[PDB]
Amino acid sequence: GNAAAAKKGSEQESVKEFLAKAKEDFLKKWENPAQNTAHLDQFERIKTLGTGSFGRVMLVKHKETGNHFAMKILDKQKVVKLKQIEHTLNEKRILQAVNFPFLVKLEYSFKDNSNLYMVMEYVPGGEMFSHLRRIGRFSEPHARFYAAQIVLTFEYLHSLDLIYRDLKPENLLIDQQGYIQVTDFGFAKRVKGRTWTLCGTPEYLAPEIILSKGYNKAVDWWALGVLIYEMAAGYPPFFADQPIQIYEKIVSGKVRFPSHFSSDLKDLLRNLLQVDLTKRFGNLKDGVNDIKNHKWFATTDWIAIYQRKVEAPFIPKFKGPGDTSNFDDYEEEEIRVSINEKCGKEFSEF
Amino acid sequence: GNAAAAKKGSEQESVKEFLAKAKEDFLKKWENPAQNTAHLDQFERIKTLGTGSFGRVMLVKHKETGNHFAMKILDKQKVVKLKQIEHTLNEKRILQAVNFPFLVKLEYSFKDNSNLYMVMEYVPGGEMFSHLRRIGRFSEPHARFYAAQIVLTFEYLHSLDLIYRDLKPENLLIDQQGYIQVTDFGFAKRVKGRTWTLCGTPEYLAPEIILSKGYNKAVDWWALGVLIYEMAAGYPPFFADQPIQIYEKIVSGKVRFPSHFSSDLKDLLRNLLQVDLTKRFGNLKDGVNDIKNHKWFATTDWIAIYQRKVEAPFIPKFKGPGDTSNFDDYEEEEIRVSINEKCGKEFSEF
Amino acid sequence: GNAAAAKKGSEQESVKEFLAKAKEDFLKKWENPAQNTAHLDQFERIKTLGTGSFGRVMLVKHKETGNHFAMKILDKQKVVKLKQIEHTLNEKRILQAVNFPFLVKLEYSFKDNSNLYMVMEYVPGGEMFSHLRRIGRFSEPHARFYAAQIVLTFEYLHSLDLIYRDLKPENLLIDQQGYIQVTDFGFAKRVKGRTWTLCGTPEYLAPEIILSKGYNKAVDWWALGVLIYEMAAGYPPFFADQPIQIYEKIVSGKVRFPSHFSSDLKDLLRNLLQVDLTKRFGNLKDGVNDIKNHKWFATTDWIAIYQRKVEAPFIPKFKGPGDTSNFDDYEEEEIRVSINEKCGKEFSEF
């Protein structure tokens, strides 16, 4: 339960076993990675869904199943020159090792002479980001629905010794049913203990990251505070034109809460946007349960949300049968793969 | 007329005299500037309309007339430290010298120990920018209405030897009636001939500016091309993540026109987004009349638009009686002015 | 439960104990009132939320908690001259004595030389009234959600021997989460038995009130009938231009139900808009349970609604970060409190 009754007891009994089966499992895939699961002829290319720094994302149809995926194609040379080899390699390992309702699923991965291909599940509703910016702000029920899902996602990731390091609306894809799916595990790190890299988006940096003092999984609960605030408010708690000014403001931590924030919402936020890590929720004795048992979460049944059985506030209805319009009617390219294998030993572990 | 009949003859006869009375006039105010026209006790402060780098914009009510203005307040020290003294001084001179339907009117200007105050007419509908981004794109009639108004604004500015240097949707305020008002004359220059400064927004830079080769009033007709394109399309012709890549693309000048652009719209745009200045419209023999007599403009009566007597496609209805909501319910400050006069000789000409 | 199973048995077992702990409790605060709980310097004034006959409502921020409340300020002299001393005094006593999910909470109360201040929780979504008038009518699920909440509110109030006497959409504030909060306890009376005052809004007067025959708590179940009808229909069952004509119609009690009313809705309404009190629901042997167990309520779990754990049909998203726009950008006053204490002995019990 969330607190069914003292069936809260069964909630916790269950969470406990669940997460134990989960470490066993991750550790096996983590420590013995699954590798090169398919090839390009198996997929019809439908349209370009997008275009990036290492290449395109494509809507593809797997020919045996008649199912649709989004294919991220990465040119080896481009990732090598952009010095993204280790981020790429790391994202793939994490992704093929992990398994939760709300993480986006890496369906297949393979390389070929030119390109690395990570075929993921296609989540047509898009990111939370644009919906949030078109709608303006989300009601505290809508915003709590999503909060509940991320708490659970972080409870799981952190048990596998994974700090996500990149929460914001742009990595939270909304699916068919109206539930979150987190994308981009390129800054996640499996770290037991403390680390030192400057990474995220400025807005969501916890004061320790900015301060270069070393940091841990407690950065993700500070970014849940930034996230609930921007969902329920419209805009981030600390934002500025220049990043260094955003930082300016973050290391002071002086937040003004909107008057329509409930006393209750404000007080969850006061302990997630905590600067003292000895007072930050999710980083105290009572771990997540300090967050999970806050009165803003009082009407949330954590098992119902896990089970995907709550009714979603909003389901996106992106327009355009087959090919959409927003996704986009781009100028279609060839995907050329070469007569020779480029970058073989760097991407050898992929 | 636009071409009433061969009343086009009277259009041009009239434009001709108009612009002559206009140089006479500007030259007088330009060469003998009006100065220090009022003081702060004359104005009730209503709300903060916004906040900038040199200070706030405030909604103010002039106590004799019961009329509303927007007061830009600039702290002398801040402008001095930001090295904006000459831009500030220059904007004010230009502004008190010029007079056209579509330019925003500087109603009064004065300084006091601390601050410089430029009281402008209040145009509550806001910038074209946000409307454009909420609506998405503008119909070629809506987009031509605005085009017509800017052609006229540039015909006038250029006759007074003024190159505007900063066109984009964010300086085009839409008033009560639905007509444009151009703000921000801080990069305008009165230059007969050619100049060399790198200035504007990346998106709107003409290839010559980027190339550092010297440039003239022909940069503003390239920025009218960027503007009609972004109004009629949704997005700029050349845009990228990094400015240097926007430049990358601008100096190649390879534009793809949307399929819903009319053959006619595309062909006006082919000669305003011209890279060869010997082929750029507004910079040929036939000056503006190459633009004014293009078939996209065929149904436009230039005198009707000047006269403000066409019916406007869209009039913004910003919400909130007195104080609005978007404009904003900020934390109100004091305006403190000091016991001593700061920066006296730098701002002496103001 | 509502009727979980014969867990209806536990519903009722529980309701029973709950309400018993509730009388104990109210009786203590009722019979020994809490008094003068704070002072004005403790609160920053943000904006005027509204203005009344005895004074303003203000958005205020309590400086220790960083929480927002709505401050009703009443000028003692004005209440004294308007002969509202006893209504004022009575509202405060009731309010500091009572405690339910759906009643609005009186957070602090104090007086000072001039004014009495009742600081309440701020419920930004506003009244149901305007939402109802903008939307037009509410679906029988939306309208039943609210009905369920008021049934529970009246079960509790009536157990404490309190007849509310003023139901209508204008006292039903919708909060952050989408649940009702009833305001205005200025006509509520703690009456065991029968009373005689003419009070309410014409539309909602039960025939006995109009007839001056004496009346009891059964007037509030007639006003629940008027309320469900206006929510599910758009307009009241009896309305006219002149109040005396509204009365005209009420004491005949001839109601025409809309064709989109369900057979089931019509039949709940036939026994709440009952003129014979020996047939009016909530006033028979089976008290509220005649209402609570009507087939219109069949899909309602009364504990879920109490527990605030149902999902709300509609959550208002009033616009304007901090200060809103609808709430209002008024001309701000001083709150002056005098060098002398006005009306001391009349408001002595406050």
Partner: peptide
């Protein structure tokens, strides 16, 4: 209200990540 500030910064669009 800083929301008006918000709109005026360029930071109303897709935010990328400093990095690596």
């Amino acid at each position: 209200t800083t929301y008006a500030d918000f709109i005026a910064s360029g930071r109303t669009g897709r935010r990328n990540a400093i990095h690596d």
